[PDB]
DNA sequence: TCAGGTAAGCAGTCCGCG
DNA sequence: GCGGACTGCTTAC
């Protein structure tokens, strides 16, 4: 089979690799790598390198790496250009693997692990390490074993060994229903002693040295713990076992106030599964614990114990040493369903990166791009100085806030990477510059033609079309591949709704789940035979449906990252090839873009509607348009609809087959304006919104820029089993706004937009009447908290403080000496309460680390002087009244006078 | 901690305002 | 009270 590498680091003058060999095998070798940078030399050296922009250059191959990276500062105090590779051990990847890498997942490493530390004092200092590390679970993809470490002895309490056979057992039982499928699974292991305990687990990782070591806050205190207590019990070098190089860089104090501690492994690549998530998951959660990720994403319950984690161990170590195990098994089915490793791994081994550079775009695409110009003997350009400037960004439209009935959207594919593709936007492209017109100019099509020779952008710039530039070449392979997982996405929602539907008339049979493949459109055969499934098989084809869909979508979504990360990393200062005339190049067409296909939509519609200069496009924003549908739907009748799907159905085939063949024209004609190399902007129909045919449903409502509702019938061809709410930018969709609220906004919208001011009265009234009965957490406010050292003066707020952070400081004046009361972490997220007035808090707000329950001690305090009508006002009553004014609907009625008594 | 981006809404602070 | 200048935060794209 074919070589590929694991691990890759540059320890001075060697470059140390970890790879598997040709015999499928793990083998580790050290380099004395000769690297080779490159200058510009006068033409006449007859060589066969030259820069992106033609220019010669000779090749300087030096001894060693330190030369090299001396050489590049001599050139810097010279001021010549340093041409080449400066990142070293990329080069050695791309000259060691120069080929598109084949990997097999299954001959990597993978491990997942976490620790348990008792402390009676505060929580257990990652850098200090000053007490006993008394379990870790270690799970090893290879072996497929979770490797459990278990302290019995310790001055923090002597414990009895933990039982397989209760962990096993249902709580409901008495047990720690540890899953069944991973008991066979355990290999446990207890210890007398922590020091025995530490040297054993050092053995198995040097027996078992992870590759791809994850986790949840791995980096923040796993593996600085088990790095900082091998450092003070056995001292350091013992510790550097961890590395398989025995190099490890500790960075790290970020005080204030203060003052944690990060280590890296040379030779292991940590992806910490919370980062992962962060970047890769498309989400905004309120909390980061586990526990809360794991009822998001799994629907599984909370870890509960009796009183608090310092006295967990002492009082029931049989639970504590199962919920261990299953933390880590938890990350485990987290990413069986969101793939987030696999994905690691596809994209760094298609870059040629270590693994965990995956995290910065601006790595992936200097390797890509870098791999691609070797390729052709051409050599890359130096890295430079810039500084930081604001630039323009895309077009919004200003919409009128209203309801609206019946709406369609259009939006483009793929905007800024097929912009880069159609006007050929790359480094090496630029052939010159034009003079300017206003915007508005090109929009109308009234500017002159800027260019009869290159491929222009508005923003004045003007680009070769003859030859494709790295940057488009490139996009264009990742654009495809994002094309392809997408297409798999929406087969398997389009089959979701299927089995949905479905499922309104389940049969009474029994029946087993079909055996097909949820990537690709059912056939009828198939759906004939899903018509006669039971619910039970119905259920479980839905749920393999949406595995296969949130699959699609992780590979889908995380390319369109990556390729949009490009867009905008040529407006990032830290990128190679940065430049904000290329920024700009992307954003400006894009503008036009935007306004000229609304210009062209209304012209179509007003042509078809035999009338001039009525307004169809209602909204816009950076690369989509909504169009209202009320004068089509009322044109035919409305009466003339057997039902909501006829109507439907009757503005999908009039976007398929009148606007968008009518957009196709419109675009077509811009790229001949702008003589652009190839015409790529491909808008196809969004969204069908309107209310339920007979309802008094307002079908969907705007408030402002970003913020609007729609009732969804049909989204890009999936045809749903039940209406979808489209919202955008409202508070049911911000991680600040509390759960509850959240909810109940939520069923306000729907009423609004299925039912009518009638059904939002009702429902007004009812939430209401509930509100004081609901759970605190589920009615608090959530808010990052930045920069909580800049306002404490204190500690009391500051001049300026920001209402969370006075939240955060009133906390911190509460849990003064109480030992086991959680910390506010700078950056982390908090639950935030107002305070009715003369509170023993002595302020309008109290603040505590969100994903946890306030501190015993103060906890009934908060409860008793919590200001219910103020958080009611702020976080319900106050959004609602914008969408119901925008909506021109009243979710309460009159006042006023009576009352009228009865008695 | 160390390197995609901009546009833009709302919560809240502070203060001007006869 | 409301509004404008401003910071902070979180969203749409
Ligand atoms: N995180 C994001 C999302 C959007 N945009 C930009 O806004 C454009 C439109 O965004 P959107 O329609 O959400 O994504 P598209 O890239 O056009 O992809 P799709 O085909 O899914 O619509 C993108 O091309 C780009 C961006 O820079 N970064
Ligand atoms: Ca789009
Ligand atoms: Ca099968
Ligand atoms: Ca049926
Ligand atoms: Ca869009």
């Known amino acids: 089979m074919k070589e590929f590498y694991l691990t890759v680091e540059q320890i001075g003058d060697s470059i140390f690799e970890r790879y598997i060999d040709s015999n499928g095998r793990e083998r580790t070798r050290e380099v004395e790598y000769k690297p080779s940078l490159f200058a510009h030399c006068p033409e006449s050296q007859a060589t066969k390198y030259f820069d992106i922009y033609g220019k010669p250059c000779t090749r300087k191959l030096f001894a060693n790496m330190r030369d090299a990276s001396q050489w590049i500062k001599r050139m810097e105090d010279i001021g010549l250009e340093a041409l080449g590779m400066d990142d070293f ?227 029931n170590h049989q639970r504590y040493i199962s919920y261990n195990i299953i933390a880590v098994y938890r990350v485990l089915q987290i990413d069986a369903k969101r793939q987030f490793i696999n994905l690691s791994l596809d994209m760094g081994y298609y870059a040629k990166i270590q693994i965990q550079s995956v995290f910065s775009p601006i790595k992936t695409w200097d390797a890509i791009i870098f791999n691609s110009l070797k390729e052709q003997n051409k050599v890359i350009p130096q890295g430079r100085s810039h500084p930081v400037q604001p630039y323009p960004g895309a077009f919004v439209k200003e919409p009128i806030p209203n309801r609206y009935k019946y709406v369609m959207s259009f939006d483009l594919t793929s905007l800024y990477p097929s912009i880069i593709r159609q006007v050929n936007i790359s480094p090496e492209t630029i052939a010159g510059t034009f003079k300017v017109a206003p915007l508005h100019d090109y929009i109308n099509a009234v500017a002159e033609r800027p260019s009869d020779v290159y491929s222009c952008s508005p923003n004045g710039m003007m680009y070769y079309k003859d030859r494709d530039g790295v940057v488009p070449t490139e996009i264009t392979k990742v654009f495809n591949q994002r094309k392809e997982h997408k297409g798999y996405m929406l087969a398997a929602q389009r089959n979701g709704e299927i089995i949905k539907e479905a499922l309104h008339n389940p049969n009474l049979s029994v029946d087993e789940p079909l055996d097909v493949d949820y990537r690709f459109d059912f056939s009828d055969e198939i759906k004939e035979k899903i018509k006669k499934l039971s619910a039970k098989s119905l259920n479980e084809m839905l749920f393999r449906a949406q595995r296969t869909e949130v699959a699609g979508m992780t590979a889908q979504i995380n390319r369109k990252l990556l390729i949009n990360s490009l867009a905008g990393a040529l407006g990032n200062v830290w990128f190679r090839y940065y430049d904000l005339r290329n920024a700009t190049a992307i954003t400006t067409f894009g503008q036009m873009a935007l306004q000229w296909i609304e210009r062209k939509v209304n012209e179509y519609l007003n042509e078809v509607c035999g009338t001039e200069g009525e307004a169809f496009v209602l909204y816009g924003d950076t690369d989509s348009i909504y169009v209202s549908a009320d004068k089509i739907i009322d044109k035919v009748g409305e009466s003339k609809f057997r039902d909501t799907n006829h109507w439907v159905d009757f503005l999908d085939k009039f976007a398929r087959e009148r606007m968008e063949p009518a957009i196709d024209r419109g675009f077509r004609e811009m790229c001949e304006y702008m003589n652009n190399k190839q015409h790529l902007m491909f808008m196809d129909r969004e969204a069908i919104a309107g209310p339920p045919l007979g309802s008094k449903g307002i079908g969907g409502f705007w408030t402002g820029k970003k913020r609007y509702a729609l009732n969804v019938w049909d989204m890009e061809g999936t045809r749903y089993a039940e209406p979808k709410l489209k919202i955008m930018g409202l508070e049911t969709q911000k991680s600040s706004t509390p759960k509850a609220v959240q909810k109940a906004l939520k069923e306000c919208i729907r009423r609004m937009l299925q039912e009518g001011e009638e059904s939002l009265q009702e429902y007004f009234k009812e939430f209401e009447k509930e509100f004081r009965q609901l759970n605190y957490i589920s009615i608090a406010s959530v808010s990052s908290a930045n920069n909580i050292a800049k306002y404490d003066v204190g500690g009391f707020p500051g001049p300026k403080c920001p209402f969370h952070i006075r939240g955060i400081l009133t906390y911190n004046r509460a849990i003064k000496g109480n030992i086991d009361a959680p910390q506010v972490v700078e950056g982390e997220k908090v639950y935030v309460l107002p305070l009715r007035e003369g509170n023993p808090f002595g302020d309008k707000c109290i603040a505590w680390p969100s994903g946890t329950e306030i501190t015993d001690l103060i906890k009934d305090d908060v409860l008793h002087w919590m200001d219910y009508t103020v958080l009611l006002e702020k976080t319900f009553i106050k959004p609602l009244e914008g969408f119901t004014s925008a909506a021109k609907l009243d979710y309460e009625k009159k006042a006023s006078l009576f009352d009228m008594f009865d008695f």
């Open 89 to 315: 051990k990329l080069a050695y990847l791309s000259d060691t693997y120069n080929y598109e890498i084949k990997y097999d997942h299954t001959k990597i490493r993978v491990a997942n692990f976490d620790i348990e530390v008792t402390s009676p004092d505060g929580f257990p200092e990652p850098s200090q390490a000053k007490h006993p590390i008394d379990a870790i679970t270690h799970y090893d993809s290879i072996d497929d074993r979770f490797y459990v470490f278990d302290l019995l002895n310790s001055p923090y309490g002597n414990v009895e060994e933990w039982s397989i056979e209760i962990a096993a057992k249902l709580q409901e039982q008495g047990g720690d229903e540890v899953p069944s499928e991973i008991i066979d699974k355990i290999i446990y292991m207890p210890f007398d002693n922590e020091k025995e305990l530490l040297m054993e687990y050092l053995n198995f990782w040097q027996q078992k040295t992870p590759v791809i070591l994850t986790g949840w806050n791995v980096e923040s205190f796993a593996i600085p713990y088990v790095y900082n207590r091998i450092k003070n019990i056995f001292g350091e070098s013992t510790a550097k076992r961890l590395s398989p190089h025995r190099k490890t860089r500790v960075k790290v104090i970020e005080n204030m106030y203060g003052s944690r501690e990060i280590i890296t492994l040379f030779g292991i690549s940590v992806l910490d599964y919370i980062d992962l998530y962060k970047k890769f998951s498309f989400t905004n959660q309120p909390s980061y614990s586990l526990d809360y990720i794991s009822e998001f994403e799994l629907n599984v319950g909370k870890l509960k114990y009796d009183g608090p984690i310092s006295k967990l161990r002492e009082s």
